[PDB]
Ligand binder design. Sequence first.
Ligand SMILES: NC(=O)c1ccc[n+]([C@@H]2O[C@H](COP(=O)([O-])OP(=O)(O)OC[C@H]3O[C@@H](n4cnc5c(N)ncnc54)[C@H](O)[C@@H]3O)[C@@H](O)[C@H]2O)c1
Ligand SMILES: NC(=O)c1ccc[n+]([C@@H]2O[C@H](COP(=O)([O-])OP(=O)(O)OC[C@H]3O[C@@H](n4cnc5c(N)ncnc54)[C@H](O)[C@@H]3O)[C@@H](O)[C@H]2O)c1
Ligand SMILES: NC(=O)c1ccc[n+]([C@@H]2O[C@H](COP(=O)([O-])OP(=O)(O)OC[C@H]3O[C@@H](n4cnc5c(N)ncnc54)[C@H](O)[C@@H]3O)[C@@H](O)[C@H]2O)c1
Ligand SMILES: NC(=O)c1ccc[n+]([C@@H]2O[C@H](COP(=O)([O-])OP(=O)(O)OC[C@H]3O[C@@H](n4cnc5c(N)ncnc54)[C@H](O)[C@@H]3O)[C@@H](O)[C@H]2O)c1
Ligand SMILES: O=C(O)c1nonc1O
Ligand SMILES: O=C(O)c1nonc1O
Ligand SMILES: O=C(O)c1nonc1O
Ligand SMILES: O=C(O)c1nonc1O
Lengths: 329, 326, 329, 326
Amino acid sequence: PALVQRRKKVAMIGSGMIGGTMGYLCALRELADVVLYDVVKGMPEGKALDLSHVTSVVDTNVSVRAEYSYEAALTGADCVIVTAGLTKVPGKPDSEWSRNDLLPFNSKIIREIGQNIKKYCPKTFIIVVTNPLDCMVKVMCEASGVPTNMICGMACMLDSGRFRRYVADALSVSPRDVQATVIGTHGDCMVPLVRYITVNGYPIQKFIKDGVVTEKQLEEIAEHTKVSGGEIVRFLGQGSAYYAPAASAVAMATSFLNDEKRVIPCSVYCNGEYGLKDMFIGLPAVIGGAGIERVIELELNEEEKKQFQKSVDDVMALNKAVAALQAPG
Amino acid sequence: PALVQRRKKVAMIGSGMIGGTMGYLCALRELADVVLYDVVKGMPEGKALDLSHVTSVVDTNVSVRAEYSYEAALTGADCVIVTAGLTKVPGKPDSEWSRNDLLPFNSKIIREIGQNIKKYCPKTFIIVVTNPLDCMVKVMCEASGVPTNMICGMACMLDSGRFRRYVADALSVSPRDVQATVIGTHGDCMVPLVRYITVNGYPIQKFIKDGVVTEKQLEEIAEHTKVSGGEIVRFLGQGSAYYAPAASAVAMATSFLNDEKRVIPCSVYCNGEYGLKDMFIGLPAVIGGAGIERVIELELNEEEKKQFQKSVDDVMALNKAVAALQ
Amino acid sequence: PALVQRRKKVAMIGSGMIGGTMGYLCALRELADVVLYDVVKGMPEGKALDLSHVTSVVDTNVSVRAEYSYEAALTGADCVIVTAGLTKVPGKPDSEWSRNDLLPFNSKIIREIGQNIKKYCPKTFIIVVTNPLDCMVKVMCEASGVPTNMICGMACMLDSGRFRRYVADALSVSPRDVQATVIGTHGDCMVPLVRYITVNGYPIQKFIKDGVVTEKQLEEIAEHTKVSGGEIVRFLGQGSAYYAPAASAVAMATSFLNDEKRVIPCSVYCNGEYGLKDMFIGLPAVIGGAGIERVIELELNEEEKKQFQKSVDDVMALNKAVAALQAPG
Amino acid sequence: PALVQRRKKVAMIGSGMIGGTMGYLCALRELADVVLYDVVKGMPEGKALDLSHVTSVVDTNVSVRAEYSYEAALTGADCVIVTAGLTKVPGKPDSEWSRNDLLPFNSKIIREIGQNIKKYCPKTFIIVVTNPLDCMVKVMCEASGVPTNMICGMACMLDSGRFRRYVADALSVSPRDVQATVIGTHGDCMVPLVRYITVNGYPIQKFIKDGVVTEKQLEEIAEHTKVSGGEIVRFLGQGSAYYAPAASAVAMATSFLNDEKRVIPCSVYCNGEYGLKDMFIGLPAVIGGAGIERVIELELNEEEKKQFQKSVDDVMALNKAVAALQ
Ligand SMILES: NC(=O)c1ccc[n+]([C@@H]2O[C@H](COP(=O)([O-])OP(=O)(O)OC[C@H]3O[C@@H](n4cnc5c(N)ncnc54)[C@H](O)[C@@H]3O)[C@@H](O)[C@H]2O)c1
Ligand SMILES: NC(=O)c1ccc[n+]([C@@H]2O[C@H](COP(=O)([O-])OP(=O)(O)OC[C@H]3O[C@@H](n4cnc5c(N)ncnc54)[C@H](O)[C@@H]3O)[C@@H](O)[C@H]2O)c1
Ligand SMILES: NC(=O)c1ccc[n+]([C@@H]2O[C@H](COP(=O)([O-])OP(=O)(O)OC[C@H]3O[C@@H](n4cnc5c(N)ncnc54)[C@H](O)[C@@H]3O)[C@@H](O)[C@H]2O)c1
Ligand SMILES: NC(=O)c1ccc[n+]([C@@H]2O[C@H](COP(=O)([O-])OP(=O)(O)OC[C@H]3O[C@@H](n4cnc5c(N)ncnc54)[C@H](O)[C@@H]3O)[C@@H](O)[C@H]2O)c1
Ligand SMILES: O=C(O)c1nonc1O
Ligand SMILES: O=C(O)c1nonc1O
Ligand SMILES: O=C(O)c1nonc1O
Ligand SMILES: O=C(O)c1nonc1O
C-alpha cells in the first residue's frame, strides 16, 4: 500500500568517528534511517553493514546505508549532520593542537557540502560539527543558502556537557541536575559561565556558602572545560573526541525531529543578540520542529562580556580570513 | 545455578490507582520485580496478572505478584512505596477536598504498615505517598524505626512537575529544561519558588525582561500549582491524580535503586534546617544509593519565609493532631 | 519560524482506563501529542492535566489535551485508538462476563466514531479496541470508509502476550524470546496456537520431549490464555484489564508511526486468506508506515482449522446480526 | 550515609574499538559504572573522559574511569567483557583475513586476563569477545577458574543478528520479529540454521511457499552471514566490526545483570550437548542472574549435523593448537 508514515532520514556527511557514532545512536534508538557519506569509499559500506547488524541485536528497525554520491546521500534528508573534514594538521605536535589550524583544510570541504545541500535538500536542518565550528557554520550557511533558523553548529552542548560532568562530580549529583553553560566560539576562548551554574535551578553560590565547593574549584573546572578537547586529543594520540560530540549532535537533531523545544546552547545565527550581526556563535537556544526557535540573550556582567568579546574576536577574525581567501569559484 | 544478580524488588503497599500505576512503570522499564499488596481481596491479583501480561507485550522480564500478607509483600523489598489509605473523605463535597481531613483515616494504616516494615524489611528505603503526606512520613518513620535517611515522602516532585509544565508551556520549551521547585508541606500551604525558576540554569528574570512571560503570569502559575491537586480531584469526580504521582515516586525509587544522585524535592527529615527538628517537610534533596544523601537549605526571601512558616505551621499542626490520636 | 517537523498526533477516542493508560505511554515515551476525548465531561480534562504533569516528571515534551468535540479530537490525528464503549453489562454477574453481550451497547458508538473519522481524519490509521473487537473493527471500517489496510483491531497481541507470559514462566525465559500466537476472534473461541510455540524460533515440541514442560501444562496455558480476560474481570470487581491492552495498542500504533514493520497478530481485513472475504479477524500481520502491509497465512492442521472455523463462525454471526440491526443514521 | 544500593560495575578489559563502544552503551543507558583498561597508556583515559562527558549530554549518571592496573580495573566488577587482543595479522592481506590466525597473538593475553580475574573478581560474569572466540573462551575458563555457568563468549548473537538483518530485509519486517540462529564456531564454519528461521514463531517454510523468499535466496543469506565479518574487514581497511559486536556483548551482560533470562546464542561450556565435553562452542542459551542458566540442544538434520561437525573440528583443532602453545 502507499507509505503514510515515512521514517525520518538523517544524512551523515562524513562517515568518520563522529559520523559513524551518530549513525550508531540512530540505530540504537530507532531514531531514523541513516545514510553514511564520505569521500573515502569502502569504509562507509563497512560501517553501514555493521550498523545494520546492530538493529537486529537491539531489536530496532531503521535502514543504514552508505551512499556514494551527494545526490543519493542528501536527497530526502530531514537533517544533515556534517563532520566531513580534518581533525588534526599533519606533522603538528599534539601539544599544539588548535581547531583554528584546520581552517585552510576544511573551508573548501564545508563550502562544497553546502553547495550540494542547496542543490539536493535545501529544506533540511543542517547541524555542522566540522571545525573550526563557528566559522564553518557561517560558511555552510552561505554556501547552502538555507534559512538562518535551519542551520546551527554543535559545540556548546559538548562544552557544557563537560562543564556539567565536572560540576556534577564535585557536588556528588547527577549531571542531569547540573545546569552549566558554555557560550561563545568553540575554541580556546569559549566562555564557561561559572556565575550561571545551577543545581536544579539552585544557584551554585549556595553550594559555595554551604562549603561544598569553592570559587577556586569552579574556576579550575571552567579552565578544564576550556581545554578538555586538547586533553582528549593528547590522550588519544590519534583523532579527537567523538562519543560526546556524536551524542550532542544527535540530541540536537532529536530535539528538531521530535519538536522537543529543548534548550541547548549551540552555534546559532545572530541578528542583534549580544550585539552581533551576520554571524554564528555559541549561544543558548531553543531547538524545535521549526529549527532554532529562539536565541537566548543572557545578562552578562563586566568580566563575562570581556570573555565573550574575546570569543567574538576569535570567530570574527576567522570569518574575515575565510572570506578574504575564498576562491571565487 | 546460584543466583548472583537478583533483580531489585519494589513492594507496592497499596494497590489502588497509584500502586498499580507504579507497578506498570516497573514492568514497562523492567526496573524491578513488583509485589502488589492491599487490604482489598482479589483486585491486586487482577492488576498483577494484567501487569505480568505487559512484560510480554513490551518485551521485558520482571515478576509482578500479588501478596496478601505483610510478610510476603515486605520481605526482601529493596524499596517500599506506600499509597495505602483514602483519597477523599466520605460524603465530603469535591469543592472541600483537603488532604488534612484524611488524617484520622490514614494515620492508623500508615502506623501499622510501618510496624510491619520494622518487622520484615527494616533495611528498605521507604517512599510514602499516602496523605497527609508530610505528617504520614513522620508517622511512618516513628513506626518503622528506619534511619532518617532511608525514608522520604513523594510530593514536591509532583508539585514541581506541575510548576515546570506550566512554565514550560508559557515559555515554549521542554519541561526538561525548566527547573522549578516547590518546597514545604504538600497541601494548600506548599511553597512554589517563583524566584528560583530557571530555564536550563538561566534566571527567569531575564525572560521576564525579554517579555516572554510576565511577573503576574508567573504568580498565576504558582497559584495554579498550589491548587492543581484539587483541580484534578474535581475533574475526575472520583479519586485523585495518579499518573504524575506514580511517575514521581518511581523516579525517586529509581534514583535510589540506581544510585543516580538526582536532585529531587521531597519530604525529608529535618536535622535543624531552618530551625526545624524531629519532623519531615518538603525540601530539595539528593536521592542516591544511600537514600537521602543531601537536604538543601535554600535562602528564602521575605515572602518565601512567610509562606514557608505557614507551611511549617500546617505540618506541625498535623503532627500535633496525630500525636493526640495515637 | 515555519514548522518543519510536526509531532505525531494520536487521538484517544474513549478516555476511560485504557484511553488514559495509552496517553500515559505516549507521554512517558514522548511518542506523540495526545488528545483525550470522551462523552464524559470533566474526567478527560483531569487525566490530560495529570498526564501533562508526567511529561515534566519524566523529562519529555508532548502536548496532552482533552477535547470535547469530535472535530478537535480527530483533526490531524496520525492514529486514532478507539476504546469508547462499555466493559460489562450492568447487572450481569462477573461469572457470566461475555464480550459478545456488549454488542448492542457498543455497535452504535463505534459506527458514529467511524463516521466522524471519515470527516475529520480519513487518512488516519485506526486501531479499534472496543469489544466485541473483531465485529467492531468491521463496523469501524464500514463507517470510517478508510482503506482496509489503514484499520485493524487490537486483541491478539494481548492474547498472545498472556500466552507468552505463561509460557515464559513455565520455561524460565524472558517473554521477549517466547513467540506464542493467538489467532481468531477475541473471545472464548480465540485460538492459542500451541503447535506454533517457539523459544527464539526453537519448536516447543522439543521442550516437551526433553521433559521441560508437559502436554497438559501447555493445554492449561492455552486454556488460561482463553479465559484470562474473564479472570481479570472477576478479580478486579469493576471494569476489565487495561495495562496490557493499552501497551498492546500503543505497540501497534508505534510500529505504524515509525514504520517498524513489526509482525503483530491483530484483527485485520481478509481478502482471501484462510478462505475469508470482506471481514476482520485476528491474524498475524505486518504493521508498517503503510498500515497493514501483509497478512500472514499460517498452514493450519485439522484441529487448528476446526478451532479457527469456530472463531470464524462467531464473528461472522455477529457481523450479520450487527448489520441487520444497524440504524441507518 | 552508608551505601545500600551500589551501581553495577562492568570492566572493559581492552579499550579499543569494541571496549570503548560498550562503554558508550553503558553510559548511554546508565547501565553501570564503567572501567576502561588497556595495555596502551593514555588512550583509555581519553575515552573515559569522552564517555564521562556523554553522561551529562544524555542526562545519565554512571562513573566512567580508566584504570592502569588489573587490580583497580577488576576489583568489584560484576561483569568483565574482554576484547583485549589483535584484530588482524600484521602484513596479512585483507582478502586472507582469518580469526584463527589470531590464536598465537591473543592466547597469552587471554590467559593472563583470566589469572587476574581469578585473583581480583572470581565471582564476576565473564564475556569473552577476543578471537578466535570459542578457543579464547576455553582459555579464559581454564585460567580464571570461574564456575562453568559464569563464563561465555559473545559471537553467535552477532552472527545471528546479521542472519536476522538479511532475512528481515528480504521479508520486509523488523528483525525484532525474525528468529534466526547461527550455532557452532565463530568462523568460516559457523552454522546458520536456515531450517529454524521463524517470523514471530511462524516457520520460514510457509513464507517460501508463499513466494516471499526462495530457498536459494535463504541459502545466499546464510552464506552472506558466514562471510559478513570478512566483508566488513575489507570495507573498513583497518580493524574490524565493532558496533554490532559491542551491542551484542552488552545485551548479554544486561541479561545477566538484570536477570532477564534472555535466550541468546553464545559460546557456552559443554557438558555433553552434542556429545561435546570440556569445550566451548556457540549454542542457544539462557542468560540470567545465575549466568548461563540453560543450554538448548536443538535437533539437527543431516546437513546441519555435517556443518556442525565441521564447526566442531574447527574449534577442536584450535584448542589442540592452544594446548600445544601454552
Ligand atoms: N564542534 C565540535 O564540538 C566538534 C567535536 C569533535 C570533532 N569536531 C570536528 O568534527 C570533524 C570530524 O571529526 P571526526 O572525529 O569524525 O573525524 P574523522 O577523521 O574520524 O572523520 C572525518 C571524516 O571526513 C571525511 N572527509 C574528508 N574530506 C571530506 C570531503 N571533502 N567530503 C566528505 N567527507 C570528507 C574523511 O574521509 C573522514 O572519514 C573534525 O573537523 C573535528 O575537528 C567538532
Ligand atoms: N503525596 C502526593 O503527592 C500524593 C499524590 C496523589 C495521591 N496521594 C495520596 O496517595 C494515596 C493513594 O492514592 P490512590 O489514588 O492510589 O488511591 P486509591 O483509593 O486508588 O488506592 C488506595 C488503596 O489503599 C488501599 N488500602 C486502604 N486501607 C489499606 C490498608 N489498611 N492496608 C493496605 N491497603 C489499604 C485501598 O484498598 C486502595 O486500594 C491517597 O491517600 C492519596 O491522597 C498523595
Ligand atoms: N480488544 C481487547 O483486547 C480489549 C481489551 C480490554 C478492553 N477492551 C474493550 O475496550 C473498551 C474500553 O475498555 P476500558 O477499560 O477503557 O473501559 P472504561 O469503562 O474504563 O472506558 C470506556 C470509556 O468510554 C467512554 N464512552 C462511552 N460511550 C462513548 C461515546 N459514545 N463516545 C466517547 N466515549 C464514550 C466512557 O465514558 C468511558 O470513559 C471496552 O469495550 C472493553 O471491552 C478490549
Ligand atoms: N566474537 C566476536 O564476534 C568478535 C567480533 C568483533 C571482534 N572480535 C575480536 O575482538 C577483539 C577486539 O576487537 P576490537 O575491534 O576492539 O580491536 P581493537 O584493536 O580496536 O582493540 C583491541 C585493544 O586491545 C588492547 N590490548 C592488546 N593487548 C592487550 C593486553 N595484553 N592487555 C590489555 N589490552 C590489550 C589493544 O591495545 C587495543 O586497544 C579482536 O581480537 C577481534 O578479533 C570478536
Ligand atoms: O572539543 C573537542 O573535543 C574536539 N575534538 O575535535 N574537535 C573538537 O572541537
Ligand atoms: O496533589 C495531588 O494531586 C493529590 N491527589 O491526591 N493526594 C494528593 O496530594
Ligand atoms: O481480554 C480482556 O482482558 C478484556 N477485558 O475487557 N475486554 C476484553 O477483551
Ligand atoms: O565477526 C566479525 O565481524 C569480526 N570482526 O573481527 N572479529 C570478528 O569475529
